[PDB]
Amino acid sequence: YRIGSYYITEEDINPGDSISLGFGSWAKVTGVIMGTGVVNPDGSVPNAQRVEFQ
Amino acid sequence: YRIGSYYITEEDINPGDSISLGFGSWAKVTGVIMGTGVVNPDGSVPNAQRVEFQ
Amino acid sequence: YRIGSYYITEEDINPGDSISLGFGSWAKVTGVIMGTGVVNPDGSVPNAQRVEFQ
Amino acid sequence: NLIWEVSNSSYGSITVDPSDSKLATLTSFEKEGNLVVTISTANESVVAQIAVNIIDGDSGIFLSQDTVTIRKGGTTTLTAVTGKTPVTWSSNNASIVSVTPNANSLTAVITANGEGNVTITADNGTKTASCEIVSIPQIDSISLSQSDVTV
Numbered sequence: 156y157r158i159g160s161y162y163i164t165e166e167d168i169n170p171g172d173s174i175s176l177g178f179g180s181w182a183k184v185t186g187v188i189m190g191t192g193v194v195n196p197d198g199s200v201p202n203a204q205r206v207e208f209q
Numbered sequence: 210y211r212i213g214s215y216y217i218t219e220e221d222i223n224p225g226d227s228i229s230l231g232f233g234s235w236a237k238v239t240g241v242i243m244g245t246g247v248v249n250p251d252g253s254v255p256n257a258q259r260v261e262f263q
Numbered sequence: 264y265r266i267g268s269y270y271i272t273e274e275d276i277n278p279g280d281s282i283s284l285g286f287g288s289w290a291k292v293t294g295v296i297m298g299t300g301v302v303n304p305d306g307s308v309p310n311a312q313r314v315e316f317q
Numbered sequence: 318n319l320i321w322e323v324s325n326s327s328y329g330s331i332t333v334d335p336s337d338s339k340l341a342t343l344t345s346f347e348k349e350g351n352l353v354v355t356i357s358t359a360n361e362s363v364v365a366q367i368a369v370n371i372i373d374g375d376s377g378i379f380l381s382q383d384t385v386t387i388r389k390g391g392t393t394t395l396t397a398v399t400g401k402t403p404v405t406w407s408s409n410n411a412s413i414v415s416v417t418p419n420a421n422s423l424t425a426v427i428t429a430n431g432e433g434n435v436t437i438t439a440d441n442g443t444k445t446a447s448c449e450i451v452s453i454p455q456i457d458s459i460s461l462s463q464s465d466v467t468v
Contacts, residue, residue: 188378191447194407201448202383222353230349236291295403295422296422304426306419309418
């Protein structure tokens with residue numbers, strides 16, 4: 156994920172102009188299981204699927 | 210089967226470093242028919258399989 | 264843990280003649296479970312560590 | 318030059334790929350533990366050592382049920398599927414819902430003693446998953462034999 160204030164793709168002449176640039180939606184979060192240690196009291200156990208977007 | 214109090218896998222560089230090795234659970238019981246002679250009263254006859262744990 | 268039916272010390276000439284031989288009580292249990300937990304399978308709190316007397 | 322070999326190559330279908338000039342390629346299979354990659358000379362008694370280790374791929378800790386709905390005073394069970402045998406279980410507000418790891422540590426018996434929403438964790442090794450266990454009220458509606466009685 157690359158963040159820039161200029162509305163120019165990475166393949167543009169002004170940018171580095173290398174590789175294919177694609178827009179990204181949403182944020183990236185490391186894989187983890189909610190409430191693994193039962194730290195949250197009275198909280199529903201959440202299930203996370205790897206490579207799953209929802 | 211190898212007996213060792215150290216938490217070192219047998220597949221280390223010091224050992225042969227071959228074959229599949231995994232940690233075991235519970236004790237080892239030799240294959241035999243439980244209650245063949247009905248020696249123990251009120252004991253249901255169990256079915257035991259090789260490498261079977263239950 | 265080593266199990267043998269011969270009453271010869273590990274350091275004796277008849278035995279392998281290496282390492283210190285010590286008497287072992289009971290059978291070795293794989294680290295992960297301790298045995299009796301729950302009537303219907305729920306599992307109790309097991310014990311771990313080596314040499315620890317509990 | 319040197320020749321790369323691995324004692325008891327069983328960790329994969331091709332344990333040690335042949336080296337082209339100096340370096341070579343490695344392979345992996347369904348095995349866990351360390352490995353030995355010795356780069357020994359053709360005839361000389363010189364053998365370098367390269368440590369390798371593929372620890373059973375990922376972990377993939379995932380509870381059997383993501384959410385639970387147990388009544389007050391009831392009991393349940395959660396069979397977690399984890400590669401590592403030791404799987405410690407815990408649950409906040411133990412007075413509401415309690416958790417006890419199984420004999421193999423894979424399963425976990427739940428006991429919703431109290432009432433209220435709470436989460437129960439498990440698989441303390443590496444990555445710890447979560448599973449909500451709502452201690453909803455039993456609401457076992459009892460009914461009197463008579464209501465409009467005349468004593």
